[PDB]
Amino acid sequence: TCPFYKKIPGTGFTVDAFQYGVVEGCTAYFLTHFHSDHYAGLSKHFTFPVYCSEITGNLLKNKLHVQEQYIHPLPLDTECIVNGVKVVLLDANHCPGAVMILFYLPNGTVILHTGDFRADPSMERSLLADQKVHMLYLDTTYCSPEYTFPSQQEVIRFAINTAFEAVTLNPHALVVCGTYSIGKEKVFLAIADVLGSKVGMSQEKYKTLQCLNIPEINSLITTDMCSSLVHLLPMMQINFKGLQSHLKKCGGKYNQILAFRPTGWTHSNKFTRIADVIPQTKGNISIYGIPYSEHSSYLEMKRFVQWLKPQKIIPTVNVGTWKSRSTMEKYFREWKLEAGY
Numbered sequence: 001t002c003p004f005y006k007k008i009p010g011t012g013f014t015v016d017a018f019q020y021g022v023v024e025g026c027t028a029y030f031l032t033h034f035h036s037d038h039y040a041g042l043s044k045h046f047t048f049p050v051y052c053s054e055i056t057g058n059l060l061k062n063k064l065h066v067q068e069q070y071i072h073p074l075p076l077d078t079e080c081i082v083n084g085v086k087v088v089l090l091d092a093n094h095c096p097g098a099v100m101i102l103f104y105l106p107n108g109t110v111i112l113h114t115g116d117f118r119a120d121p122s123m124e125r126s127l128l129a130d131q132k133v134h135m136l137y138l139d140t141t142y143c144s145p146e147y148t149f150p151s152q153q154e155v156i157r158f159a160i161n162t163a164f165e166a167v168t169l170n171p172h173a174l175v176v177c178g179t180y181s182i183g184k185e186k187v188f189l190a191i192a193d194v195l196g197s198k199v200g201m202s203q204e205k206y207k208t209l210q211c212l213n214i215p216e217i218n219s220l221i222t223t224d225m226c227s228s229l230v231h232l233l234p235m236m237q238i239n240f241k242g243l244q245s246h247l248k249k250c251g252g253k254y255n256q257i258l259a260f261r262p263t264g265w266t267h268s269n270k271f272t273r274i275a276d277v278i279p280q281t282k283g284n285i286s287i288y289g290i291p292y293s294e295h296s297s298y299l300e301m302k303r304f305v306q307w308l309k310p311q312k313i314i315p316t317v318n319v320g321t322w323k324s325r326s327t328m329e330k331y332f333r334e335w336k337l338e339a340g341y
């Protein structure tokens, strides 16, 4: 059965609730983004209305074969009416097509569901600037002060310089990048761009990328692996065995692999600065874990919330243990007392 934090009170609406069967009283299902924990349950047999971004709608149609008649894509930053309720989708600064949803309830309550987000000061000049928000359903993934990581910009800088240096020293090195979902496409795109290569990948991943409306994409990606020196592979294959095996398949074109695993936060963020990051090496294979996050750091989340000043917060992540729930509630209270709302 559908949990309470996936329901929008006073509406016919749910958010990211497709794994529960038919939800009692649900007249429209919103989907914030195409990540599997959120889309779980959707397919070609789904016959209710789904509301989402254009990009998300492209993936529903082409990857899960949902029928066109039930996909309702909405423009960003635009007041829209859905079953008699005013809504707005806003960019979530998560993966491609990821939104936050503003709901304007009949009774005057205003609710913001962030879906999955990376809070940014640029959100303080969206349509959020104009009015008060009563409830905030918040992506609390890294809601604890030990969660620090660098900006996305600093991480790409590190990666571009690393890859550029290695291939310039050895023109027979291959660069490999791990993936398991949409998101983080800048990692592999920026590296291909500095090396003047296209990024090569399987047919299923190429398809997924063709749904994302990225400008001049046909110029960056390809399924011909032989013509590319930046390869994408599934994240699980980014280990010494998986990579040695892959190198075999390249038939003596390359004699070295430099690979990257984009993670979220790892505990080595507590001690090491981005400039100081070093790989794990075995033979002619090196692997860098790089902390490219698409979720708010603690400080980025705090800033957004203390700006917003919601009357009530409902977490959507880490909600399963009393210890986590308790911890999050203590931080909300601090933030509230510190800012004075």
Ligand code: NI
Pocket (backbone or CB within 6 Å): 033, 035, 094, 116
């Ligand atoms: Ni996500």
